[PDB]
Write an enzyme that holds these catalytic residues in place. Structure first.
Site, PDB file in Angstrom:
ATOM      1  CD  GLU A  31       0.358  14.867  -6.115  1.00  0.00           C
ATOM      2  OE1 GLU A  31       0.087  13.677  -5.844  1.00  0.00           O
ATOM      3  OE2 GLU A  31       0.965  15.214  -7.152  1.00  0.00           O
ATOM      4  N   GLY A  32      -4.518  14.369  -5.039  1.00  0.00           N
ATOM      5  CA  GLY A  32      -5.611  13.898  -4.207  1.00  0.00           C
ATOM      6  C   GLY A  32      -5.024  12.993  -3.147  1.00  0.00           C
ATOM      7  CG  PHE A  34      -7.881   7.321  -3.169  1.00  0.00           C
ATOM      8  CD1 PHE A  34      -8.176   6.001  -2.860  1.00  0.00           C
ATOM      9  CD2 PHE A  34      -8.466   8.320  -2.407  1.00  0.00           C
ATOM     10  CE1 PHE A  34      -9.018   5.683  -1.810  1.00  0.00           C
ATOM     11  CE2 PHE A  34      -9.309   8.005  -1.354  1.00  0.00           C
ATOM     12  CZ  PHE A  34      -9.586   6.686  -1.055  1.00  0.00           C
ATOM     13  N   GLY A  35      -4.033   9.529  -5.364  1.00  0.00           N
ATOM     14  CA  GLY A  35      -3.794   9.937  -6.740  1.00  0.00           C
ATOM     15  C   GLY A  35      -3.518  11.396  -7.001  1.00  0.00           C
ATOM     16  CB  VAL A  37      -5.064  16.032 -11.311  1.00  0.00           C
ATOM     17  CG1 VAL A  37      -5.569  16.587 -12.651  1.00  0.00           C
ATOM     18  CG2 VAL A  37      -6.150  15.236 -10.596  1.00  0.00           C
ATOM     19  CE  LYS A  56      -8.425  11.745  -8.621  1.00  0.00           C
ATOM     20  NZ  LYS A  56      -9.679  12.194  -7.965  1.00  0.00           N
ATOM     21  CG  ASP A 142     -12.092  16.084  -0.688  1.00  0.00           C
ATOM     22  OD1 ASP A 142     -11.737  16.608   0.383  1.00  0.00           O
ATOM     23  OD2 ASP A 142     -11.272  15.789  -1.594  1.00  0.00           O
TER      24      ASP A 142
HETATM   25  C1  LIG Z   1      -4.468  24.197 -10.074  1.00  0.00           C
HETATM   26  C2  LIG Z   1      -5.427  23.115  -9.561  1.00  0.00           C
HETATM   27  O1  LIG Z   1      -6.388  23.666  -8.645  1.00  0.00           O
HETATM   28  C3  LIG Z   1      -6.231  22.528 -10.679  1.00  0.00           C
HETATM   29  N1  LIG Z   1      -6.362  23.082 -11.839  1.00  0.00           N
HETATM   30  C4  LIG Z   1      -7.167  22.334 -12.622  1.00  0.00           C
HETATM   31  C5  LIG Z   1      -7.621  22.505 -13.927  1.00  0.00           C
HETATM   32  N2  LIG Z   1      -8.420  21.632 -14.483  1.00  0.00           N
HETATM   33  C6  LIG Z   1      -8.821  20.554 -13.821  1.00  0.00           C
HETATM   34  N3  LIG Z   1      -9.616  19.533 -14.201  1.00  0.00           N
HETATM   35  C7  LIG Z   1      -9.754  18.634 -13.179  1.00  0.00           C
HETATM   36  C8  LIG Z   1      -9.056  19.051 -12.122  1.00  0.00           C
HETATM   37  C9  LIG Z   1      -8.424  20.303 -12.493  1.00  0.00           C
HETATM   38  C10 LIG Z   1      -7.574  21.226 -11.850  1.00  0.00           C
HETATM   39  N4  LIG Z   1      -6.959  21.378 -10.614  1.00  0.00           N
HETATM   40  C11 LIG Z   1      -7.028  20.510  -9.422  1.00  0.00           C
HETATM   41  C12 LIG Z   1      -8.483  20.395  -8.928  1.00  0.00           C
HETATM   42  C13 LIG Z   1      -8.601  19.416  -7.747  1.00  0.00           C
HETATM   43  C14 LIG Z   1      -7.900  18.075  -8.072  1.00  0.00           C
HETATM   44  C15 LIG Z   1      -7.919  17.248  -6.851  1.00  0.00           C
HETATM   45  N5  LIG Z   1      -7.977  16.627  -5.901  1.00  0.00           N
HETATM   46  C16 LIG Z   1      -6.439  18.238  -8.532  1.00  0.00           C
HETATM   47  C17 LIG Z   1      -6.400  19.147  -9.770  1.00  0.00           C
END
Ligand SMILES: C[C@@H](O)c1nc2cnc3[nH]ccc3c2n1[C@H]1CC[C@H](C#N)CC1
Length: 293
Positions: A31-32, A34-35, A37, A56, A142
């Site tokens: 979770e960000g 604004f949103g 993922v 996202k 951030d």
């Molecule tokens: C598990 C989590 O840290 C994560 N795993 C990811 C794998 N691939 C990704 N590609 C883009 C984001 C992303 C990922 N994120 C997070 C990173 C930070 C984001 C924010 N805010 C949420 C998703």
């Protein structure tokens, strides 16, 4: 005569256009503000063979997500997560999926594989990505271990740009308006006090991120945990002011266990109270590289 219809122009395929009907949700990644993922599979053949992608989307700020998409679409660097495309009518941002996740997920599980030398190499990589961002006149705002993605044991990438803002040409900072969900324990004094954001403010955050990296992102050693121990955990709405005052007195996060003094001094140069007195990303790179050789 006959029903006049329109002649159809020949359809091209846009590899950056992801059709909603083939984008299948697997699970939440994070979770960000604004949103959020999600892990999806883009599966136009419908047989579970499609590529996995990070998606996202807004929580039910469209303008802000569109701005984020335009920023990321035009960043090209090995230490910045790859843009893949968009899914539109509302809009979703499609990015590469990194199965190892962020440093917050990866470090606690891989302590035994990741030694000081590998930590410093990640530190150099984060600085290179950030220096690239600064050269494009952006402030990230951030930078924390949770936003640093692990591509492999040997490579990291900055993996979210939800708060990234352009610094106006010939200007030195961006003035923040919405600050409700600020990561205050990663923030430099000028950000906390005056809501101004310099490239030097990202250098400060990098210092805190380096601290996390050096503690392998353990929750009991996190910047929040440690600061609340320093100032008190029960100050509610006075927390930030107490934080500002602690920083004014010269107090900083302590040296991580097993972190050499020479690494800790590089970290302290990120945390000069005055922005103009802080080290730069290029100087940090030089400092780390000298420790690596
Ligand atoms: C598990 C989590 O840290 C994560 N795993 C990811 C794998 N691939 C990704 N590609 C883009 C984001 C992303 C990922 N994120 C997070 C990173 C930070 C984001 C924010 N805010 C949420 C998703």
């Amino acid at each position: 005569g006959d029903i006049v219809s329109e002649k159809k122009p020949a359809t091209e395929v846009d590899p950056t256009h992801f059709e909603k009907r083939f984008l299948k949700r697997i699970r939440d990644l994070g979770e960000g503000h604004f949103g959020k993922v999600e892990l999806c599979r883009y599966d136009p053949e419908g047989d579970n063979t499609g590529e996995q992608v990070a998606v996202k989307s807004l929580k039910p700020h469209i303008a802000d997500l569109k701005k984020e998409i335009e920023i990321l679409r035009n960043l090209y660097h090995e230490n910045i997560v790859k843009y893949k495309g968009i899914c539109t009518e509302g809009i979703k941002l499609i990015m590469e999926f990194l199965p190892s996740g962020s440093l917050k997920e990866y470090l606690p599980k891989n302590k035994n594989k990741i030694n000081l030398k590998q930590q410093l190499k990640y530190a150099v990589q984060i600085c290179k990505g950030m220096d690239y961002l600064g050269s494009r006149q952006y402030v990230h705002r951030d930078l924390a271990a949770r936003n640093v993605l692990v591509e492999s044991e040997h490579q990291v990438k900055i993996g979210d740009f939800g708060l990234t803002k352009a610094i106006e040409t010939d200007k030195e900072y961006y003035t923040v308006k919405d600050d409700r969900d600020s990561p205050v324990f990663w923030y430099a004094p000028e950000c906390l006090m005056q809501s101004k954001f310099y490239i030097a403010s990202d250098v400060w955050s990098f210092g805190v991120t380096l601290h996390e990296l050096l503690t392998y992102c353990d929750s009991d050693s996190s910047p929040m945990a440690l600061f609340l121990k320093m100032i008190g955990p029960t100050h509610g709405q006075m927390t930030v002011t107490r934080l500002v005052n602690t920083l004014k007195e010269g107090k900083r996060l302590p040296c991580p266990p097993n972190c050499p003094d020479e690494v800790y001094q590089l970290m302290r140069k990120c945390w000069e109270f005055q922005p103009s007195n802080r080290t730069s990303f290029q100087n940090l790179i030089e400092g780390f590289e000298a420790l690596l050789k």
